[PDB]
Ligand binder design. Structure first.
Ligand SMILES: [Mg+2]
Ligand SMILES: [Mg+2]
Ligand SMILES: [Mg+2]
Length: 150
RNA sequence: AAUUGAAGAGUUUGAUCAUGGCUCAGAUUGAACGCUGGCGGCAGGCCUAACACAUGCAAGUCGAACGGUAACAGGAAGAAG
């Protein structure tokens, strides 16, 4: 149950006396399938180097999120830089409908049946990230009782 | 049981993030045109000039309201084919 997938691979340019020196960047997401998900970025002069150098970063850099069986407990909003993301429980019929790129984090995460949309820029590096922190801030469908009960 | 349902992509930059317009995937149509074209079922068919219109047809019916016979039908004292 490794389960991983890269979301966006891109090229960039550095520019020096001798001209442009190009490079690449991968952005990836690994999840266990039962909560626990992280993303990694990582960049390198050539693509395979970078997509791999990324996968690892994600293995570390990994949060975990309090699911509720196949779905989220309540609805949540996430918002990093220019991306404002919103995703919702959805008493699954099928579900998992969302902006491929946050479908990525959502399935490896293990959510099985949510609807989402991304507002603002769909800049991958900031959505997959806005959603993570999104799922992250999410909270205990029980241990709000922790907070209260008391 | 009976609205229990939401995706994003391309494009300013050497490159970047943002701002932002343009653009695309969708569905829908009383449609036209180019190419092509076998059959059926249900449907639709002047969106323009409330422009103008030849011709037929689109409102008649009742003799159980009435005087009635001109048509075609029988029939009639009776005049006969
Ligand atoms: Mg970093
Ligand atoms: Mg260019
Ligand atoms: Mg033809």
């Amino acid at each position: 149950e490794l389960q991983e997938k890269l979301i966006a691979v891109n090229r960039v340019s550095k520019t020096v006396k001798g001209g442009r020196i190009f490079s690449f960047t991968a952005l990836t997401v690994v999840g266990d399938g039962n909560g626990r998900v992280g993303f990694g970025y990582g960049k390198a002069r050539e693509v395979p180097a970078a997509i791999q150098k990324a996968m690892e970063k994600a293995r570390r850099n990994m949060i975990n999120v309090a699911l509720n069986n196949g779905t989220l407990q309540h609805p949540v909003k996430g918002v990093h830089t220019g991306s404002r993301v919103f995703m919702q429980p959805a008493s699954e019929g099928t579900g998992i409908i969302a902006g491929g790129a946050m479908r990525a984090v959502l399935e490896v995460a293990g959510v099985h049946n949510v609807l989402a949309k991304a507002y603002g820029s769909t800049n991958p590096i900031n959505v997959v990230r806005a959603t993570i922190d999104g799922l992250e801030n999410m909270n205990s469908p029980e241990m709000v009782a922790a907070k209260r009960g008391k």
